[PDB]
Amino acid sequence: TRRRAYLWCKEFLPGAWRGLREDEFHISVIRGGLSNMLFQCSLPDTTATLGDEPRKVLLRLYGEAMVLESVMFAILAERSLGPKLYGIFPQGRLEQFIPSRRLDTEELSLPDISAEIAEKMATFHGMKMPFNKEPKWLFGTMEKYLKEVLRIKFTEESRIKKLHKLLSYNLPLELENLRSLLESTPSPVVFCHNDCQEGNILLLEGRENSEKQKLMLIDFEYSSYNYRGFDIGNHFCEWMYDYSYEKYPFFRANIRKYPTKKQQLHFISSYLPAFQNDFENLSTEEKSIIKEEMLLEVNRFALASHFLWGLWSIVQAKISSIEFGYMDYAQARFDAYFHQKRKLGV
Amino acid sequence: RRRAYLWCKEFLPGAWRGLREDEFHISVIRGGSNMLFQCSLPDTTATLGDEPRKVLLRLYGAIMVLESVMFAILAERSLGPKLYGIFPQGRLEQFIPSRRLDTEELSLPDISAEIAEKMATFHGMKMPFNKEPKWLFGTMEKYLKEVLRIKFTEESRIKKLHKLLSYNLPLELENLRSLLESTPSPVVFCHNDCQEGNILLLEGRENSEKQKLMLIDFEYSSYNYRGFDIGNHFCEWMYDYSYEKYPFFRANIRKYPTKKQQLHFISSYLPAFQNDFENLSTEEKSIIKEEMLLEVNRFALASHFLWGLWSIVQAKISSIEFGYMDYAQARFDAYFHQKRKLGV
Known about the structure:
Two copies of one chain form a homodimer.
Chain A: H1 2-12, E1 26-31, E2 37-42, E3 56-61, H2 65-78, E4 85-89, E5 92-96, E6 100-102, H3 111-126, H4 137-151, H5 157-167, H6 171-183, E7 189-192, E8 201-204, E9 215-217, E10 224-227, H7 228-237, E11 241-242, E12 252-253, H8 261-275, H9 284-319, H10 326-344
Antiparallel strand pairs in A: 1-2, 2-3, 3-5, 4-5, 6-8, 7-10, 8-9, 11-12
Helix pairs in contact in A: 3-8, 4-9, 5-10, 6-9, 7-9, 9-10
PDB class: transferase
Keywords: kinase, transferase, choline kinase, phosphatydilcholine, alternative splicing
Assembly: dimeric
């Protein structure tokens, strides 16, 4: 693996990289795993660059999808909305290394942080991409996962019991009820991230005192044309889930951590002028009509966030070997789904 | 045909998204592996915003990530047709009102000067692809391997191949290896197929001296020796692929650029490619040029060899009505003629 990494960096990267020896190669693990492993690759600090080649890069090893992912990543790189792309090959890619950390769950609620996520998401949403513009993604995905879910058979008792509790809700009928609520909820179709969680938002080192330009959104692998309401509602759902809990089930869920109407309004108040550059010049009461209906829009689409990820999580409980309480997480999402219906009175 | 309506309806914005099937228009441009079409809105329909009134559909036919990433990158940089949609069966691209150049137009001073400048621009780009120049001989070794094992059923083809194999193609490749390894040439991002048929003359730009053309169809592109891209383009001055009768090409060795015409090309290329060249002395400029002439005339030998070999393989597998074996023989004849000229 060291040898393979060396060879990619040597052949894809220009300048000092082109004549680097194996023994001069510096690599270390950024992330392990069975898929999307990450490595930091660098020049000896004693090595001069010959030009504007990077001193350090990120290697991503994978471990239509591939074609679309790659075209998407390249376009974002060209537009300065994602890491630059230095090299692409069957088994992975080389990207810009961005010194940074990810946001913690508790930081999503900080006013400056949420204001900037809103601005960044709005920008993302206004971009033109060469992808199918028809919003079949949301329900096509849920239908895909539901089919799988109804075929699952566990052998171990605890998983058997957890599954039968979830199935007892009549998921097919419940998905038809959700389709109906969303049928009557107008929402623009935009280019959505679909996974805007803290773990996919970088706090960029050097600018943690910058007020409006300290973040970058990454990991656009679930991205697609989709209802705007899904992206924002999904993001609001993620204020409640903390994935860094060190004991089983490896997440904490807190329903009271969902943004208040006042926190929701602060977010959409940054989103709207960013998406519609003239918005601020509208009559104050058209502004209020817009905001109130959008609030209803995103809180209805938040239900699809629960439903989609709950179903996904049940499929993972069968096919993934990652250490995570997938069945416990699906139940957390379905608990939130029903609570949010009771909140909305639906 | 409803497939095409659906892709345009689904991938294209504005007035395209609410389009009914009975208002959709599609015309052919090239039948057959890369079938070309021309889809458009009704002349009565008004645009809601940006959307193109007309687009080009490309079908991958019989056969992806690299070519698609390349095409997307060139679109973003304004160096290729825009990319409007991408799917497993093809892509929708911007439609550029233009025509291709004719072979004879390659030698016109203003045309030649611009191609040189465009190629220099292509040559300076950074692309996320392998920078080792393994393409040239890797490709030639690959086609040679296929050539040594193919069997024709037709007697004419069997005899044409026999004459070609009689040159001792493996030994001649090693002869070309020693020549080229002794010939320095910088590695750059090469088009690799810069012929008249891949150069657009843009509509309404005919009077522009310096900006009337666009380079297209970068499917063979890779990091490769700069000498190849230039020597290859010089060879293309000799081949006219629009001839109306079998073998569907004309070859003319006398149409290879004179020294004068070659210097005219490189004198436009060089200032456009290396930033410091314009400010060099007359005498350092002439030194670079003379060495560049030796460089590219030598690499032109690889253009005849590679495409001769390629053309033998195509004779086996291609459906296209084209005299592939005769073209292969035309390329090997020019190969040997150019060696005699150069004294190598």
